Coordinates of C-alpha atoms and ligand atoms in Angstrom, one line a residue:
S1 CA -16.2 9.0 9.7
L2 CA -12.5 9.6 9.1
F3 CA -12.6 7.6 5.9
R4 CA -14.4 8.1 2.6
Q5 CA -15.3 4.4 2.5
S6 CA -12.7 2.4 4.5
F7 CA -9.0 2.4 5.5
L8 CA -8.1 -0.1 2.7
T9 CA -10.3 1.5 0.0
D10 CA -9.3 5.0 0.6
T11 CA -5.6 3.9 0.7
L12 CA -6.1 2.3 -2.7
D13 CA -7.7 5.5 -4.2
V14 CA -5.1 8.0 -5.3
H15 CA -7.6 10.8 -5.5
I16 CA -8.5 11.6 -1.9
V17 CA -4.2 11.9 2.2
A18 CA -4.0 14.9 4.4
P19 CA -3.4 14.4 8.2
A20 CA -6.6 14.1 10.3
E21 CA -7.5 12.9 13.8
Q22 CA -10.7 11.8 15.5
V23 CA -11.9 11.0 19.0
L24 CA -14.5 8.2 19.3
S25 CA -17.4 8.1 21.6
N26 CA -15.7 5.5 23.8
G27 CA -12.5 7.6 24.1
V28 CA -10.5 5.7 21.4
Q29 CA -8.3 8.0 19.4
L30 CA -7.6 7.6 15.6
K31 CA -4.9 9.5 13.8
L32 CA -4.3 9.3 10.0
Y33 CA -0.7 10.5 9.6
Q34 CA -0.6 9.9 5.8
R35 CA -1.9 7.5 3.2
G36 CA -2.0 4.0 4.8
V37 CA -0.7 5.0 8.2
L38 CA -3.3 4.9 11.0
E39 CA -2.5 5.2 14.7
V40 CA -5.0 4.0 17.3
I41 CA -4.6 5.2 20.9
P42 CA -6.6 3.7 23.8
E43 CA -8.8 5.9 26.0
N44 CA -6.8 5.1 29.1
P45 CA -3.1 4.5 28.4
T46 CA -0.9 3.1 31.1
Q47 CA 2.7 2.0 31.7
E48 CA 1.7 -1.6 30.7
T49 CA -0.2 -0.5 27.5
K50 CA 1.2 -2.4 24.5
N51 CA 2.5 -0.5 21.5
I52 CA 1.8 -2.7 18.5
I53 CA 2.8 -2.0 14.9
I54 CA 0.5 -4.0 12.6
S55 CA 1.8 -3.7 9.1
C56 CA 0.5 -5.4 5.9
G57 CA 1.2 -5.0 2.2
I58 CA 5.0 -4.8 2.3
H59 CA 4.4 -7.0 -0.8
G60 CA 1.5 -5.6 -2.8
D61 CA -0.2 -8.8 -3.9
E62 CA -0.6 -10.2 -0.3
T63 CA -4.1 -8.9 0.3
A64 CA -5.7 -11.2 2.9
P65 CA -4.1 -9.5 5.9
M66 CA -5.0 -6.1 4.4
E67 CA -8.7 -7.2 4.4
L68 CA -8.4 -8.4 8.0
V69 CA -6.8 -5.0 9.0
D70 CA -9.6 -3.2 7.1
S71 CA -12.3 -5.0 9.1
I72 CA -10.5 -4.3 12.4
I73 CA -10.4 -0.6 11.6
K74 CA -14.0 -0.7 10.7
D75 CA -14.9 -2.4 14.0
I76 CA -12.8 -0.1 16.1
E77 CA -14.4 2.9 14.5
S78 CA -17.9 1.6 15.2
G79 CA -17.0 0.7 18.8
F80 CA -17.5 -3.0 18.1
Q81 CA -13.8 -3.7 18.7
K82 CA -12.6 -2.9 22.1
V83 CA -9.2 -1.0 22.0
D84 CA -6.8 -1.4 24.8
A85 CA -3.4 -1.3 23.1
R86 CA -1.8 1.6 21.2
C87 CA -1.5 0.5 17.6
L88 CA 0.0 1.7 14.3
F89 CA -1.7 0.2 11.3
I90 CA 0.2 0.3 8.1
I91 CA -0.7 -0.5 4.5
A92 CA 2.8 -0.2 3.0
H93 CA 3.1 0.2 -0.8
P94 CA -0.5 0.7 -2.0
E95 CA 0.8 1.4 -5.5
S96 CA 2.0 -2.2 -5.8
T97 CA -1.3 -3.5 -4.5
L98 CA -2.9 -1.7 -7.5
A99 CA -0.4 -3.2 -10.0
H100 CA -1.3 -6.5 -8.3
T101 CA 2.4 -7.4 -8.0
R102 CA 4.9 -8.2 -5.3
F103 CA 6.8 -5.0 -5.9
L104 CA 7.4 -2.4 -8.5
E105 CA 11.1 -2.0 -8.8
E106 CA 12.6 -4.0 -5.9
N107 CA 11.5 -6.3 -3.0
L108 CA 10.6 -3.8 -0.3
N109 CA 11.4 -6.4 2.4
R110 CA 15.1 -6.6 1.5
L111 CA 15.7 -2.8 2.0
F112 CA 15.9 -2.4 5.8
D113 CA 19.5 -3.5 6.4
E114 CA 22.6 -1.3 6.5
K115 CA 24.0 -2.5 3.1
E116 CA 24.2 -0.1 0.1
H117 CA 21.1 0.0 -2.1
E118 CA 20.3 1.6 -5.5
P119 CA 17.6 4.3 -5.5
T120 CA 14.2 2.7 -6.1
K121 CA 10.6 3.5 -5.3
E122 CA 10.8 0.9 -2.5
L123 CA 13.9 2.4 -1.0
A124 CA 12.2 5.7 -0.4
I125 CA 9.3 3.8 1.1
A126 CA 11.5 1.8 3.4
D127 CA 13.1 5.1 4.4
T128 CA 9.7 6.4 5.4
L129 CA 8.8 3.2 7.2
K130 CA 11.9 3.4 9.4
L131 CA 10.7 6.9 10.4
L132 CA 7.2 5.6 11.3
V133 CA 8.7 3.0 13.5
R134 CA 10.9 5.5 15.3
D135 CA 8.1 8.0 15.9
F136 CA 5.7 5.3 17.2
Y137 CA 8.2 3.6 19.6
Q138 CA 9.6 7.0 20.8
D139 CA 9.2 7.3 24.6
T140 CA 7.8 3.8 25.1
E141 CA 9.3 1.0 27.3
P142 CA 11.0 -1.7 25.2
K143 CA 8.9 -4.4 26.9
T144 CA 5.7 -2.9 25.6
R145 CA 6.9 -3.0 21.9
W146 CA 5.3 -5.3 19.3
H147 CA 5.6 -5.5 15.6
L148 CA 3.5 -7.9 13.6
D149 CA 4.3 -7.8 9.8
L150 CA 1.6 -9.6 7.9
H151 CA 2.4 -11.5 4.7
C152 CA 1.1 -14.3 2.5
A153 CA 3.2 -17.2 1.1
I154 CA 3.8 -17.4 -2.7
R155 CA 3.9 -21.2 -2.7
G156 CA 2.1 -24.0 -0.9
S157 CA 3.0 -25.7 2.4
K158 CA 2.0 -28.3 4.9
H159 CA 1.9 -25.3 7.2
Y160 CA -0.9 -23.0 5.9
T161 CA 0.2 -20.4 8.5
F162 CA 3.7 -19.9 9.9
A163 CA 5.9 -17.2 11.2
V164 CA 9.6 -16.1 11.2
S165 CA 11.2 -14.6 14.3
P166 CA 14.2 -12.3 13.5
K167 CA 17.7 -12.8 14.8
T168 CA 19.0 -10.1 17.2
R169 CA 20.9 -9.9 20.4
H170 CA 17.9 -8.3 22.0
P171 CA 15.3 -10.7 23.8
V172 CA 12.5 -10.5 21.3
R173 CA 11.2 -14.0 21.6
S174 CA 9.0 -13.6 24.7
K175 CA 6.4 -15.7 26.5
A176 CA 3.7 -13.3 25.4
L177 CA 4.7 -13.5 21.7
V178 CA 4.8 -17.3 21.8
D179 CA 1.4 -17.5 23.6
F180 CA 0.1 -15.2 20.8
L181 CA 1.4 -17.6 18.1
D182 CA -0.4 -20.5 19.9
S183 CA -3.6 -18.7 20.5
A184 CA -3.6 -17.6 16.8
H185 CA -3.2 -21.2 15.7
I186 CA -0.1 -20.4 13.7
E187 CA 1.1 -23.9 12.8
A188 CA 4.8 -23.2 13.0
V189 CA 7.5 -20.6 13.8
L190 CA 10.9 -20.4 12.3
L191 CA 13.6 -18.9 14.5
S192 CA 16.1 -17.1 12.3
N193 CA 19.8 -17.7 13.1
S194 CA 21.0 -14.8 11.0
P195 CA 20.4 -11.0 10.8
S196 CA 18.1 -10.0 8.0
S197 CA 16.9 -7.1 5.9
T198 CA 13.1 -7.3 6.5
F199 CA 10.8 -4.8 8.1
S200 CA 10.2 -7.2 11.1
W201 CA 13.9 -7.7 11.6
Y202 CA 14.4 -3.9 11.6
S203 CA 12.1 -3.4 14.5
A204 CA 13.6 -6.3 16.5
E205 CA 17.2 -5.2 15.9
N206 CA 16.7 -1.5 16.4
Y207 CA 13.9 -1.3 19.0
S208 CA 13.8 -4.7 20.7
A209 CA 10.3 -5.2 19.5
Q210 CA 8.6 -8.6 19.9
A211 CA 8.5 -9.0 16.1
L212 CA 7.4 -11.5 13.5
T213 CA 6.9 -11.8 9.8
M214 CA 3.7 -13.8 9.6
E215 CA 2.8 -15.9 6.5
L216 CA -1.0 -15.9 6.4
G217 CA -2.3 -18.1 3.7
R218 CA -1.5 -17.6 0.0
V219 CA -1.7 -14.6 -2.3
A220 CA -5.1 -13.8 -4.0
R221 CA -7.0 -10.7 -5.1
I222 CA -9.0 -8.6 -2.6
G223 CA -12.4 -10.2 -2.0
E224 CA -11.1 -13.5 -3.3
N225 CA -9.2 -14.7 -0.3
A226 CA -9.8 -17.9 1.8
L227 CA -10.6 -15.6 4.8
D228 CA -12.2 -18.3 7.0
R229 CA -8.9 -20.1 7.2
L230 CA -7.6 -17.0 9.0
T231 CA -10.4 -16.8 11.5
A232 CA -8.2 -18.2 14.4
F233 CA -5.5 -15.7 13.7
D234 CA -7.8 -12.7 13.4
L235 CA -9.5 -13.5 16.7
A236 CA -6.2 -13.9 18.4
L237 CA -5.2 -10.5 16.9
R238 CA -8.4 -8.9 18.0
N239 CA -7.9 -10.3 21.5
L240 CA -4.4 -8.8 21.5
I241 CA -5.4 -5.3 20.6
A242 CA -8.2 -5.6 23.3
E243 CA -6.0 -7.2 25.9
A244 CA -8.5 -10.0 26.4
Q245 CA -9.1 -13.8 26.5
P246 CA -5.7 -14.9 27.9
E247 CA -6.0 -18.7 27.7
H248 CA -3.5 -21.6 27.3
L249 CA -5.8 -24.3 26.0
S250 CA -4.3 -24.3 22.5
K251 CA -1.4 -26.5 21.3
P252 CA 2.2 -25.3 20.9
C253 CA 3.1 -24.3 17.4
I254 CA 5.9 -26.3 15.8
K255 CA 9.3 -24.7 16.5
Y256 CA 12.0 -24.8 13.8
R257 CA 15.6 -23.7 13.7
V258 CA 17.9 -23.2 10.7
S259 CA 19.8 -26.4 10.0
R260 CA 21.9 -24.6 7.4
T261 CA 21.8 -21.8 4.9
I262 CA 22.3 -22.5 1.2
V263 CA 24.4 -19.9 -0.8
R264 CA 24.7 -19.8 -4.6
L265 CA 28.4 -20.1 -5.5
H266 CA 28.3 -20.6 -9.3
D267 CA 26.3 -19.5 -12.3
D268 CA 25.2 -23.1 -13.0
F269 CA 22.9 -23.6 -10.0
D270 CA 19.5 -25.2 -9.8
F271 CA 17.1 -27.5 -7.9
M272 CA 15.5 -30.8 -9.1
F273 CA 12.0 -29.9 -7.8
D274 CA 9.6 -27.7 -9.7
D275 CA 9.1 -24.0 -9.2
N276 CA 5.8 -24.7 -7.4
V277 CA 7.8 -26.5 -4.7
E278 CA 6.2 -26.2 -1.3
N279 CA 7.7 -24.5 1.7
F280 CA 8.9 -27.0 4.3
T281 CA 9.3 -29.8 1.8
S282 CA 11.3 -32.4 3.6
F283 CA 14.0 -34.7 2.4
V284 CA 15.7 -37.9 3.6
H285 CA 19.3 -38.0 4.6
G286 CA 21.6 -37.9 1.6
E287 CA 18.8 -37.1 -0.9
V288 CA 20.0 -34.8 -3.7
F289 CA 17.6 -32.0 -4.5
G290 CA 19.8 -29.7 -6.5
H291 CA 23.3 -28.7 -7.5
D292 CA 25.7 -25.8 -7.3
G293 CA 28.3 -26.0 -10.1
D294 CA 29.6 -29.5 -9.7
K295 CA 29.0 -30.1 -6.0
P296 CA 25.4 -31.3 -5.6
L297 CA 22.9 -30.3 -2.9
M298 CA 21.8 -33.0 -0.5
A299 CA 20.1 -33.2 2.9
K300 CA 22.5 -33.5 5.8
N301 CA 20.3 -34.8 8.7
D302 CA 17.2 -36.8 8.2
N303 CA 14.8 -34.1 9.5
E304 CA 15.7 -31.3 7.2
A305 CA 13.1 -29.4 5.1
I306 CA 13.6 -26.6 2.6
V307 CA 12.1 -23.1 3.1
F308 CA 12.1 -20.1 0.9
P309 CA 13.7 -21.6 -2.2
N310 CA 14.8 -19.2 -5.0
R311 CA 17.0 -20.2 -7.9
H312 CA 17.0 -16.7 -9.4
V313 CA 18.9 -15.4 -6.4
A314 CA 22.0 -13.5 -7.5
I315 CA 25.4 -15.0 -7.0
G316 CA 26.7 -15.0 -3.5
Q317 CA 23.2 -14.5 -1.9
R318 CA 21.2 -17.2 -0.1
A319 CA 19.1 -19.5 -2.3
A320 CA 17.4 -21.5 0.5
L321 CA 17.0 -22.3 4.1
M322 CA 17.2 -25.9 5.5
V323 CA 15.3 -26.2 8.7
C324 CA 14.3 -28.8 11.2
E325 CA 12.2 -29.0 14.4
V326 CA 14.0 -28.0 17.5
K327 CA 13.9 -28.8 21.2
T328 CA 13.0 -25.6 22.8
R329 CA 12.4 -24.0 26.2
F330 CA 12.1 -20.6 27.9
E331 CA 15.3 -19.3 29.5
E332 CA 14.8 -16.0 31.4
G333 CA 11.7 -15.3 29.3
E334 CA 13.4 -16.0 26.0
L335 CA 12.6 -18.9 23.8
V336 CA 15.9 -20.7 23.1
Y337 CA 16.8 -24.1 21.7
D338 CA 19.1 -27.0 22.5
Ligands
LIG401 ZN1 5.4 -11.3 1.8

């Protein structure tokens, strides 16, 4: 009723983006601030009502989550989906989804930190996203804040689904967030040990949001995704916006910590494995898998795995993450390790 065809289709069509609101029969409120920005407010908001930012498309070619979000919007508008939490749905960067690329000028998910950046289409976008976050979390209790940034991996992995929890002094690794991971059947969660520049990290660092960057499957065109493999996640996400089905029958996702961070020191840097190297590819102690100048790269422990490898990474930046399972527990409602 608010859309010509659907949230994702309208967003993708350049010829339609003026603000508009709408109140559903069940009391749910929908507000389209601008292209790809949809707020959903529950009929009966309370002090315990969650404020969830659900973003997708930070990278244009990662369509699966966009499709899931599109169906959730459709179900909420038809009353089929019960709405209990205040949400902000975002399809960031629709222009890149059209070019079917990761980005147009620069990786949007590296532009949220305080470093200096050159002017790019993505910079201006990131600038706008920081504003949307601010407006949505304004006058909300920190404990109610959630930010789920939905992505897709660019390479294979023994973990079809996994998530990354940002590093901040704020307690953003809660019991509810972890329960969500488990209910969603996310195979593993990587706990960052260093401040980042992602959209997820920005919410955690600046608004203490229970935030994650979630890798849902692989990249594929719209209508050509392996959607069934995301059924568990989608159901867990629907239960979250509806504040329902709070069970603990599922298994704990694997918890990883950063063994060490690899930084490119010289121009002559490379890995021995192929470019289609899978995330979480493990190594044995002392195994060489690359080299930086003269000094080779080899596993330190016996339980290390490589994550997010990138040999094109400019000099001085990180080329990879070495991770390993970690012994975890909850201390004062925060998931910590060791
Ligand atoms: Zn991504």
